[PDB]
Amino acid sequence: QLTTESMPFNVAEGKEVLLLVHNLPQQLFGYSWYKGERVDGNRQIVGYAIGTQQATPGPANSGRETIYPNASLLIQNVTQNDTGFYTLQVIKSDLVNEEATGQFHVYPELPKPSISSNNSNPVEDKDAVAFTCEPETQDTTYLWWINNQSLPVSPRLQLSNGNRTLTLLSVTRNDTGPYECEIQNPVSANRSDPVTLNVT
Template sequence: MGPLPASPCRLHVPWKELLLTASLLTFWNPPTSAQLTIESMPSNAAEGKEVLLLAHNLPQNIAGFNWYKGQSVDGNRRIIGYVIATQLTTPGPAYSGRETIYPNASLLIQNVTLNDTGFYTLQVIKADLVNEEAAGQFRVYPELPKPSITSNNSNPVEDEDAVALICAPEIQNTTYLWWVNNQSFPVSPRLQLSSDNRTLTLLSVTRNDAGPYECEIQNPVSANRSDAVTLDVRYGPDVPTISPSKSNYRPGENLNLSCHAASNPPAQYSWLINGTFQQSTQVLFIPNITVGHSGSYMCHAHNSATGHNRTTVRIITVSVPDSSPGLSAGTTVSILIGVLASVVLL
């Protein structure tokens, strides 16, 4: 898996510098022809933090200003006002007690909530009664909790079941990401994501789909990742193997056969000799075998979780070694003496 992405940056607003600027602007408004604008610091805020709506390019000869919630001047949605001459603030119907207005027309909102998301309009009242307006906006996001993964089937059967993994909780304006085997979401025809990425579906699972799986949730101000989840994929048994591979034995040897089949959960084993059940063990041991033990040895593997069965057969031959054809030692000696006698007579 790739490393986690860096946490979103938190903008640190230098409030002391801004307040100093505010004080200077109270006594000096530089001539400007630039358009009045509003800058949100930050534009994406975490729930419970604070946001400063900073006014730029204020006109000259300001008598006062008002802030409104929304994109228009509406008396019912007025938050707070400020009168330059008296330096008095006048709260409005939309004032919550968390707003502070500064002499430079900037508005500080503390302990922001999700409901604070939206537009804010500054109305600048000039001495000539020709007002100017500008709007700015910001969005408030929640600090994301640690997500969790739930599964509709934690014990799927290989090549038979599908599995849906769901990342919770469901949070609006949140990005959902998945990590599989410590890597970002792989491209596979057997892996499908829902339209909101919250649900990961595995079609026809295999033993290689055990995981681990993690989900991550992100928004512009925070990120968090779930604990890893694994699947207990039930599979097998595969075709069993019998060891050792030896098939030919001599009378008096011990026959020790072991059977193994890949299986989850582990398989249950039984042995049949020439079609007759012998015992339910993984290892078959027969000491001091005879020729009568020759025959067909079948290992039967069963998985109670999948309901599958597999068998394999080993033909065992027990035989006496053949005597090598030829003359006995006594006969060979007699022939040799006869040959030597003939040589002497000649």
């Protein structure tokens, strides 16, 4: 049961991903890595022939891919477009083909976000000011930080636009504190400048 493992599963842009191979048969004739779930000649990335110990790039090669004698495929200077499935073809000594599949995801290196307010001078007795992390990004998870702690879940803490927008239904002067926003993707995360609440 040939299997493939992508180490790491998630990779930031510009780094490299190494695909490992397990349960490799004892008798082998050659390997081949193809872009996509289907073994097709046009999608061949690289091939290796144990008999002649020759490694030859395929039509889909871009110079960033190298094949090791242990069937491991190394891709350097990865990019977002590389996110997809990869299939390994193993040719046994008897030339009967055995296939396997693997995948990995590429994610951007997010920047520190920013916060904007729809009201800059909250009314002390009550107000419905709204906060939002403006630099919207895909497949990102938003976290709101208040007073150096996670937001206390309460109905007064409304959320919108998924939860990229945080609205305090009823503000109070006791709510004064540092307001900070974080974005985290499967690979990286850091926070924004803490905004303050104005009252007197």
